[PDB]
Amino acid sequence: MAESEGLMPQDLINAKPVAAAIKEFFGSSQLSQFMDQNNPLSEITHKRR
DNA sequence: CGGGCTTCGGCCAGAGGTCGAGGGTAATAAGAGAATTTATACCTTTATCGTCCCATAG
Numbered sequence: 091m092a093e094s095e096g097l098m099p100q101d102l103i104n105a106k107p108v109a110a111a112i113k114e115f116f117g118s119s120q121l122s123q124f125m126d127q128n129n130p131l132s133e134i135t136h137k138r139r
Numbered sequence: 140c141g142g143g144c145t146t147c148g149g150c151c152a153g154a155g156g157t158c159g160a161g162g163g164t165a166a167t168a169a170g171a172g173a174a175t176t177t178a179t180a181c182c183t184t185t186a187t188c189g190t191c192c193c194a195t196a197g
């Protein structure tokens with residue numbers, strides 16, 4: 091319902107949901123987990139998992 | 140030929156080792172302003188309870 095003159099593209103889009111989704115996936119997903127750094131081989135076998 | 144009567148098929152419930160150990164992540168937006176109640180603060184009024192003088196019973 092907003093007008094082209096009444097609203098600007100920067101004021102229409104809310105970027106909060108995409109940032110929240112990216113943060114949630116990168117911090118709380120099952121596949122996101124702390125790297126095994128006790129061995130250099132542990133890192134390689136974790137990233138190739 | 141309707142009717143008990145057995146049987147079968149679809150649907151839902153419940154239950155799935157224990158004890159560790161470590162790590163991480165956990166949840167937001169109206170202002171105004173009017174109104175009503177409530178905790179506060181000062182003050183007076185009555186009773187209460189600590190307190191002692193006094194007459195007396197032995």
